[PDB]
Amino acid sequence: LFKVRSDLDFAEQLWCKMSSSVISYQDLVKCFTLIIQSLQRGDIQPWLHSGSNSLLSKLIHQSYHGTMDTVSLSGTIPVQMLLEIGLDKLKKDYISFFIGQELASLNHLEYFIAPSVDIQEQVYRVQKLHHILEILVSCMPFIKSQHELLFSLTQICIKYYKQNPLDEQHIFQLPVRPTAVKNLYQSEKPQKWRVEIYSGQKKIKTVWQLSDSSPIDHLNFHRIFFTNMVTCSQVHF
Amino acid sequence: GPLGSMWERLNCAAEDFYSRLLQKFNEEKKGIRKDPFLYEADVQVQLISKGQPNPLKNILNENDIVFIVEKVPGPLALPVGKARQLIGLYTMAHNPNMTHLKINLPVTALPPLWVRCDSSDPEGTCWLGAELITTNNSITGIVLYVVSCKADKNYSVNLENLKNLHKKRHHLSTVTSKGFAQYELFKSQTAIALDISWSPVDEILQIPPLSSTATLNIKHLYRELKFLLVLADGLRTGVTEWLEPLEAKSAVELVQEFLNDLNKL
16 A cells, blocks of 8 residues: 555645536636635635745745735636646655655656746656556556566656657566566466577577467468468578 | 669669668668658658567567568558568668669668568568678678468477478587567556566477566556646647536635635634
8 A cells, every 4th residue: 555645735735626626717717816815815824845836836925925916817827827736736746656665766757847848848747757657557466566676667667758758659678587477477378489599690590489369460361379480591692 | 663674773773772771770870750761652661779669579589670661551561572572672782792883882781671571472471581691891691581470270390390490401510599488467558578588498388497588578547637637738729628526515615615724723
């Protein structure tokens, strides 16, 4: 049972509430109107986790130590405002998962966390963090209690997603010791079994393989076993 | 084009193929032109770099940089005869004994070339490949690979037969072996398999020993994140696909109620 981040601040609790109820733009205007007035009236003193660049946090600091800006909740500002609050809170969820499980350091995550990039790029990077968690969750049943396997996987995923878009077909390779994975294969019937015969000239080979489905995607076939062979010829110039 | 006709050598079919392909190797060593180039309107050619899915991984232990050639639209296969011509061009374009009319620098070894075939050929060829053999910088030969694939109720194979078959065919006295097995752990991104390889093989269907080398091969979201994206898209397009609410209290009530609680100390 992983530890849920429950130490939520005013902005984060706001996000949780509004994220389960808001159904229109006017919802956002009215919700933010009440909070801003509650602040200008000085009726509340909310706490924030340090280090947030959201408009709301700004407007809160200005309420505590001084007095606030005339915001004007027009155009897309009320959307923006909730989006910011959501980003902070979600980034902090991910940080606490990865740091807390010792899968990565704050330093490692910096790219995904970045404040400087535009709001759609920040959102996009949260989706990369999520996609990393999905990968981890997918493998957990198999690399159960192998913290270094979990760790490396997280590292190679981070490395990949700083440089690459989310939509690319990609195969991650995670080196694993056969002992750490014994039970998953030793009594199991393999989906493919391949013997390759060569000699010094490692390019020159004969290959036999058995598969329980077609190893050739373009092969049009119009319990079945699939067998295939690879043979070669040397040609000298 | 000039291919198959008297003007083939004359108009440089091979050299123009070798040049085209040299663009990509030289290109992809940086830019990744996400377009497989149309060599012959009906024939396209992709290079496979990085850690992208390699179609040859299904049948081979090596994961090298490689061209894949196929019929223009799963992927489609050229007739065997056509694939053999293309394997021919690639071979000649790298042959030192071949007169060159355009290319005036020594030819570089290009990534191996592989071509999807339709079988339809007595011996049921599904792939043809060509790989260069280079001594230092100097070329010397090519390996020509044939792949055939059969599906049946039965199968028969003998570790000794394949050992000899390799020995007879390539005139050799010793021979070693490398084993590989794949186990599908999870299907449905979303696909996980375990790849295991060892040396040497002493048994067909041998169970990979624990000293084998191995890797894990890895190929309604929750509401808060879904809401996030809803807001993001709305902001981008002006069309917000609001979600059904979870709470019976409206946004405003929940917020007012939140505010009430924070005023009471």
